[PDB]
Design a protein around this ligand. Sequence first.
Ligand SMILES: [K+]
Ligand SMILES: [K+]
Ligand SMILES: [K+]
Ligand SMILES: [K+]
Ligand SMILES: [Mg+2]
Ligand SMILES: [Mg+2]
Ligand SMILES: [Mg+2]
Ligand SMILES: [Mg+2]
Ligand SMILES: [Mg+2]
Ligand SMILES: [Mg+2]
Ligand SMILES: [Mg+2]
Ligand SMILES: [Mg+2]
Ligand SMILES: [Mg+2]
Ligand SMILES: [Mg+2]
Ligand SMILES: [Mg+2]
Ligand SMILES: [Mg+2]
Ligand SMILES: [Mg+2]
Ligand SMILES: [Mg+2]
Ligand SMILES: [Mg+2]
Ligand SMILES: [Mg+2]
Ligand SMILES: [Mg+2]
Ligand SMILES: [Mg+2]
Ligand SMILES: [Mg+2]
Ligand SMILES: [Mg+2]
Ligand SMILES: [Mg+2]
Ligand SMILES: [Mg+2]
Ligand SMILES: [Mg+2]
Ligand SMILES: [Mg+2]
Ligand SMILES: [Mg+2]
Ligand SMILES: [Mg+2]
Ligand SMILES: [Mg+2]
Ligand SMILES: [Mg+2]
Ligand SMILES: [Mg+2]
Ligand SMILES: [Mg+2]
Lengths: 186, 263, 183
Amino acid sequence: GISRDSMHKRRATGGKQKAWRKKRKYELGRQPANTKLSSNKTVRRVRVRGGNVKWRALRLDTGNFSWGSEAVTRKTRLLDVVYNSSNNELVRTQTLVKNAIVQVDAAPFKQWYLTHYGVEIGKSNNVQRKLEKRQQGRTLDSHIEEQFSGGRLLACISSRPGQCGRADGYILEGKELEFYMRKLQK
Amino acid sequence: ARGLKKHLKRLNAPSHWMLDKLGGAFAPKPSSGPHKARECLPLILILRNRLKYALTYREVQSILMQRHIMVDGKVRTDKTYPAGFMDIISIPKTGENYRLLYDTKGRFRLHSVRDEDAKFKLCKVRSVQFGQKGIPYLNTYDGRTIRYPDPLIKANDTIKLDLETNKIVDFIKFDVGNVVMVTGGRNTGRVGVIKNREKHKGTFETIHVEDAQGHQFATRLGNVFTIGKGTKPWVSLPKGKGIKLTIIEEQRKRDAAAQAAAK
Amino acid sequence: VHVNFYRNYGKTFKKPRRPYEKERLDAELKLVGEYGLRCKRELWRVQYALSRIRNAARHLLTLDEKNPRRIFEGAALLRRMNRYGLLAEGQDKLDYVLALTAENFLARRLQTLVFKAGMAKSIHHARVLIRQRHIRVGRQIVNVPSFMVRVESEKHIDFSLTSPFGGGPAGRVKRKNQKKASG
RNA sequence: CCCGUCGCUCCUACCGAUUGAAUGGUCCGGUGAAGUGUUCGGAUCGCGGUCGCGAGAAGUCCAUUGAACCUUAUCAUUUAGAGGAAGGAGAAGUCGUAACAAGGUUUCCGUAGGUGAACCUGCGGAAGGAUCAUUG
RNA sequence: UCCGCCGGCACCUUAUGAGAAAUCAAAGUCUUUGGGUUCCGGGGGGAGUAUGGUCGCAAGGCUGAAACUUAAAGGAAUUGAC
RNA sequence: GCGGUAAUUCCAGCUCCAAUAGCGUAUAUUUAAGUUGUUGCAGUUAAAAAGCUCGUAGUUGGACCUUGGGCCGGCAUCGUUACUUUGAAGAAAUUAGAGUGCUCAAAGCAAGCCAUCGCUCUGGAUACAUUAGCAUGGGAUAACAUCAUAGGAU
RNA sequence: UACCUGGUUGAUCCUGCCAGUAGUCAUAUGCUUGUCUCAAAGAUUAAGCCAUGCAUGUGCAAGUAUGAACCAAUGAACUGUGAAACUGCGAAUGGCUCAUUAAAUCAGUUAUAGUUUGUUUGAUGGUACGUACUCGGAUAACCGUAGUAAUUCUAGAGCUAAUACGUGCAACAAACCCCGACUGGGCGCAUUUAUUAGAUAUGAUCCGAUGAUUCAUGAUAACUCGACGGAUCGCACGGCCGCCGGCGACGCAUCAUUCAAAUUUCUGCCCUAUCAACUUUCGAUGGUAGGAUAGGGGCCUACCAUGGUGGUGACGGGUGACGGAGAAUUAGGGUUCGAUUCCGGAGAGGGAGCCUGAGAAACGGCUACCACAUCCAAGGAAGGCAGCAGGCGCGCAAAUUACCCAAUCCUGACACGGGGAGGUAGUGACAAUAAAUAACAAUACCGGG
Ligand SMILES: [K+]
Ligand SMILES: [K+]
Ligand SMILES: [K+]
Ligand SMILES: [K+]
Ligand SMILES: [Mg+2]
Ligand SMILES: [Mg+2]
Ligand SMILES: [Mg+2]
Ligand SMILES: [Mg+2]
Ligand SMILES: [Mg+2]
Ligand SMILES: [Mg+2]
Ligand SMILES: [Mg+2]
Ligand SMILES: [Mg+2]
Ligand SMILES: [Mg+2]
Ligand SMILES: [Mg+2]
Ligand SMILES: [Mg+2]
Ligand SMILES: [Mg+2]
Ligand SMILES: [Mg+2]
Ligand SMILES: [Mg+2]
Ligand SMILES: [Mg+2]
Ligand SMILES: [Mg+2]
Ligand SMILES: [Mg+2]
Ligand SMILES: [Mg+2]
Ligand SMILES: [Mg+2]
Ligand SMILES: [Mg+2]
Ligand SMILES: [Mg+2]
Ligand SMILES: [Mg+2]
Ligand SMILES: [Mg+2]
Ligand SMILES: [Mg+2]
Ligand SMILES: [Mg+2]
Ligand SMILES: [Mg+2]
Ligand SMILES: [Mg+2]
Ligand SMILES: [Mg+2]
Ligand SMILES: [Mg+2]
Ligand SMILES: [Mg+2]
């Protein structure tokens, strides 16, 4: 099957390397998962070397995304795939891979922001005596806040969907975000 | 090739297993265990080839199944169990508590220790780090692992470890001026005092040792085993404890001829 | 695998480079004649052993005196020579062992000692008696004429208890004659 | 003593018209079994409330590893071949005498031409020459 | 004309040198074997031939085998014979 | 090289010779072979100096720089190598080699002794193992760049 | 034993080779062969083809007995042994061979801070709650209806078990993090992602490790349709008023260790230049981001750059080339060999693909194609001796279709079964060791002091 040997490759001198043994199991490869962004989730268990298990996600619709600045992780549904660094047809086909820019709805993050900072964007005495303390340092990026009204936040996938069976990631902020914005604006 | 090997050819056996070359095609492969299978003496090579208690690979089993062997304070039945260094082979009934010590020629000797000295042993100490939930553990050099060690204990130390109630009684740090027995290489079985340790950033910590009789020899950071604090070992050495080069062995043979017999 | 394959094995004689030389042929025949041998192999193997010993001694003498790998095997070689009655008590140096010769070895054979001890009428009678199980060294019967005796056992060669020459019953020839004369 | 052409016999190798022949290998191309993953599919089975859920075979779709066969080309090995032609060996020879003596034209190199064969001749060179020498 | 120095082409005498010898003042300082470096030979034929490569208008040049055959071919000197 | 009417060489008898339970023959290859030559061959005439010069890589490169000096746990930050010494790690088997009377030997790693309800803690040594790698001392002989715009040292 | 001798000439001194001389754990062969010990043995040619028989199975007190089984017993579940069968484990070791393979395997030396690891040893398992005095449905052996020419080929029916399969109380806490009633949710262990602590080295002031890490580890936010967190077996019976309790067996998870593998650093290999340039559009060298893998990596994909090796021999070709430890001969240096019992690699006729499993691209496992070849009732079925023995063929060239687990060891649930591994006998002038085939006297004959 698919193999990871240098057996079929060529020497650094550009000379053909002959074959002295067959293919071996401990050096095999497998077909790519080619994860898709779809509403009908499906993840299939794979049995790997040693008897352990890999989770090959064929279709996903939700994910676990983290806002690093406020350090809050929420489960939210991905809406679209907008950018792919490697192949430009992986966004047309809407394939979930690592480092692929996606859009996730901001409803859980809006709810957390409202219930934590006491401010809506997009009770007796303790709560009010503690809310203004969090409101003192409350500051948000304009580019970050302009997406709450739109309902979808740009984010980046940091997990490997075809290996862990999941699509987790982090919300784009700071120097990252505009770098992709200047690549997504037209 | 496709997996593990369950056979050990006689010619491939370790040298300290002095086995007759024309005794068979196979040697007893040491089982998985506390010791490295090349610095170990399997039980088959104890009741046989060292004691005349058993005569074949049929009476070693006939006396292990009676649960007559108690290595390191525990009955063991696997005839190829790797007793590897300073293990207390405590034969009950007859009372043959033996410490596995290293002969000056790299051999293995069953030093007959007294029973009350057989309730403990010593272990060399591998790295010491933090376990799960932040619980430090010991991880000695004979597979043993002890949780909650005293913070003074560090790597390469030695610990005096009890058997019936397995807890560290005391320990010796690794430093110059301590008795050390070498357990690897050509200098195996030679006791001495560490003079200085030389450190090379990257590998190969070399230890220089001074023999009691004036000789000096070097070895690796491994293969050494601290025995006692200062210059007094905590265990009884088998005999000699010195390298005893070939010429003085010839002298011993000569004087043995000229005395005792003397005729 | 066959474990018997692991038994070491070797050869003990060499044969000469030039096969047809008059002086060498007469020398070898001379030695064979009065040492009661069987062929030139019985002497070529003695030459081979002596050559090995001489080569070892010469290699030892090439080393420095204060070299332990000279002292130890020099002592061992001299011990073996003084043990086998080759070197005299007045020759305790590595130089004397280089001067050894084949007749020194052939003088220590059991047949030679039996002949020189007066027990045999001739060196061929000695070999015949040895091969017929009439001789014991110490307490052990020996029927190998090439048995190299040591000094400590030189005083124990004697006809065996079972031998008619050492106090045994008459052989089948004498018993047959007594049977004939009985009736 | 000795050289070559020619005539007879045997042995080895070479050139050689046949788009030779056979064998193995490689690249490209076409067909492409079977397995593996995926898509749809749903024979049937179990349970639940005369209503749902779960498992699931045949089949099918795409991708992938890819045996194997079928042409072309190419590489390597052995061999047939009319005819030509070269060496060697052979106690049978024919024709001369090229070399060894100043070998009867001193001998030999490079080059060019010529003739039955050794060879001859033109030009330059050498002594390994038959001269170590003409202050006469 | 006489003396001397450096450089060159040679020549004469003699080994205490070398060499199979002829002979050589270098062809010496070599079994008492080693200053540096390039090319190049391995018994005589086949043979500087076959073929491939390559330069040349060509004649040709550089590189360059094998099968097979053979017990000698050869160098220097010596005595005869011519 | 022998045999062409006297054969020391063929065919046989006798006698003798060499090895001897071993000997002959054929292939392959070690020696012999200083006829592959680093040690250690050759090149005027025996085979073998290129027609001659230039020329990069390669190989090879003048001399110069510590001697008198007798005695005899720290703590740095540094020209790099070759060479040489010492150490370590280094599979066994084979080889060399210590012990050991398998009846000897090739072998084996056994055994030996008072004459025991046993002992010798019985022994089951030790070398070498190119080169490359790791570490310690030495700096003679060698190779690299470093050498006067001071952009030097304190 | 650091060695020479014959052959060019009328004779001499050389160069020079031909022939002679001795060894070969080196193969044939020829003649001969009494004894003891020790031993190679279808490698060379064909990794060519195979009749036949064997070479891998396995049960302890301790998973599952109701044989309509045996041995004993005499209203109780079983309450002795136990065939078969389900379940678990093994068959990835050993054995054989050297075809492919020339920095490739392999040797010495490195690295995993780049990974997986049944097993053995040591340590460690608080969150299920939203019938627990113990849950559910099947099924084998068994019994009886069969099909087919046929095979450990195959279909129906009726019973019955689990440490098989599938559900489910997981039994009883603490600490902490969040949202919060005015003066409740989360939280075992495992997975994935993100943030954060892991210090220097308010007076008095905890905090590991490496040469080297954002490392070991801790806290936090969440996430997952989580084969995890004992519905299991043997022996002994006891102490507290129903309660409690011992010594074991098997099993699940994490870490360390052992058994290992995979990949990897540096240096090192025979002949050839009549092999001087090779590799790259389609991976050749590098970068970026992914995919895949147990894991690093052009290992693969998209985009980008034009690089990489070579007279210090790349590239290509030959090998009657597996590499090494080693073998023969050796004054020293050296030359030649290394299929074979020890280590490593590769293969099961030739290629390819794969299941199970901790471990295989396994062939005494499957699937397909090619080449052979086997029955057959002509519809189909089953193949792999480079395992042991044996046969054909090929050749100059190589033995018994024997006995046994007694030894060495390995494997299984296991003290107990099994082992063509291994040992023992048979053939054996491969090689090698010791060693008979007569010794003495008299007489006859002949010599020397
Ligand atoms: K298995
Ligand atoms: K290696
Ligand atoms: K990888
Ligand atoms: K398994
Ligand atoms: Mg390290
Ligand atoms: Mg004239
Ligand atoms: Mg003429
Ligand atoms: Mg003329
Ligand atoms: Mg020639
Ligand atoms: Mg005659
Ligand atoms: Mg020569
Ligand atoms: Mg000439
Ligand atoms: Mg010439
Ligand atoms: Mg010239
Ligand atoms: Mg100089
Ligand atoms: Mg010859
Ligand atoms: Mg007999
Ligand atoms: Mg079964
Ligand atoms: Mg194997
Ligand atoms: Mg090749
Ligand atoms: Mg390499
Ligand atoms: Mg960490
Ligand atoms: Mg990557
Ligand atoms: Mg690409
Ligand atoms: Mg081959
Ligand atoms: Mg080999
Ligand atoms: Mg074989
Ligand atoms: Mg092998
Ligand atoms: Mg295989
Ligand atoms: Mg076959
Ligand atoms: Mg296969
Ligand atoms: Mg088979
Ligand atoms: Mg197999
Ligand atoms: Mg034979």
